[PDB]
């Protein structure tokens, strides 16, 4: 027998829906190491990292949150769907942990949040939010 | 015995060598001395 709070991490988005959401996020992948150096040399973005994400959710800086399925200690993500619902932001649990890491140039990542995206795509972000 | 192990044989030789009396010219510039019969090596 599995407790509800633990149980809710079983039901991800559908695979096709997941891919579509991931693809939509993809272009807002943060500034990468070589690029950062180039920018510096001359003279928006997806925010990650669990502590930072909790603050972003709390302060309603968050607008859409994507949560990884299967971090090894459940506790470090356990509060997050509940918190997101309470502070009233759309959240989605996505199947693949590694890919969310790839999306931020890391070997793994826990959650990723999108505060705002370009005006031309705002409707699509609203659609993902609606699905969630 | 007839047989020995090499370390033991070498040691028996060492004791034998040790016995040899003080050199006669040296006295012209002993107290400690193995004797076989009544004073066993034991090792």
């Amino acid at each position: 027998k599995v407790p509800p709070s633990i149980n809710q991490f079983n039901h991800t988005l559908p695979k096709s829906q997941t891919q579509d959401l991931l693809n939509f996020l993809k272009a807002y992948k943060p500034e990468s190491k070589t690029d950062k150096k180039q920018r510096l040399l001359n003279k928006l973005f997806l925010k990650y990292g669990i502590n930072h994400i909790t603050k972003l959710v709390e302060n309603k800086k968050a607008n859409l949150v994507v949560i990884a399925n299967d971090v090894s200690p459940i506790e470090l993500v356990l509060f997050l769907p509940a918190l997101c619902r309470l502070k009233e932001v759309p959240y989605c649990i996505v199947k693949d942990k590694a890919t969310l890491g790839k999306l931020v140039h890391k070997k793994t990542a826990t959650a990723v949040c999108l505060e705002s995206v370009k005006k031309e795509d705002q409707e699509k972000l609203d659609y993902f939010a609606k699905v969630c | 015995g007839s047989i020995k192990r090499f370390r033991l044989k070498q040691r028996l030789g060492k004791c034998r060598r040790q016995n040899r009396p003080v050199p006669h010219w040296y006295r012209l510039k002993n107290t400690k001395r193995r004797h076989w019969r009544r004073t066993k090596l034991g090792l």
Binding site: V2, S5, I6, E75, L76, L78, F79 | -
Partner: protein, 204 residues
């Protein structure tokens, strides 16, 4: 923020989700061999809050220790002293079980490292399972950092074997100051020795 939530979630315990979870963890541990390295801290909140600092040669070890008394060690079940000491069965060790657990990793097994600290993790009737944080001092990351640096000094080998861990501070009574702990403070032996110490001067 994140760590606060996880702290409170672990704080409740006998809440359903945690209780299920502890049982599952305890099951896994009951299978695993007695001392083993773990990938990254099992309880991030407690470990980080305690000694742990993530970058490079800080390593986690999970250790299993047997519960209850230890029994008096006298052979064949009889003690030849006075009746006051004749009791074999109910005798109780001075070190806490947590300290023993830090010892079991701390001595030969992980003996490159130095034990920094240790946190609770989980329990069953047969075993208590503790996680021990240990740190290397022969690798640059600890040598360079001005923070935490001290543990590389030669004078901090084997803290867990000397009562110089949080558990160590505990069973020596060093945790509680004030009049209530009285004689403990400069060391229990040292304090006894000072009180006994009988002093004379040249002219009296």
């Amino acid at each position: 923020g994140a760590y606060k939530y996880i702290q409170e979630i672990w704080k409740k315990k006998q809440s359903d989700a945690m209780h299920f979870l502890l049982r599952v963890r305890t099951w896994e541990y009951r299978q695993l061999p007695v001392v083993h390295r773990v990938s990254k801290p099992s309880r991030p909140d407690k470990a980080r809050r305690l000694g742990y600092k993530a970058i490079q040669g800080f390593v986690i070890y999970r250790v299993r220790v047997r519960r209850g008394d230890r029994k008096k060690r006298v052979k064949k079940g009889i003690v030849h002293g006075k009746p006051k000491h004749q009791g074999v069965h109910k005798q109780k060790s001075t070190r806490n079980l947590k300290s023993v657990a830090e010892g079991k990793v701390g001595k030969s097994i992980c003996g490159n490292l130095r034990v920094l600290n240790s946190y609770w993790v989980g329990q069953d009737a047969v075993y208590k399972y503790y996680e021990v944080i240990l740190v290397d001092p022969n690798h640059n990351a600890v040598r360079n950092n001005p923070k935490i640096n001290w543990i590389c000094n030669p004078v901090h080998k084997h803290r867990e074997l000397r009562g110089l861990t949080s558990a160590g501070k505990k069973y020596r009574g060093l945790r509680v100051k004030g009049h209530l702990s009285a004689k403990s403070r400069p060391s229990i032996r040292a304090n006894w020795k000072r009180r006994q110490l009988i002093k004379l001067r040249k002219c009296r």
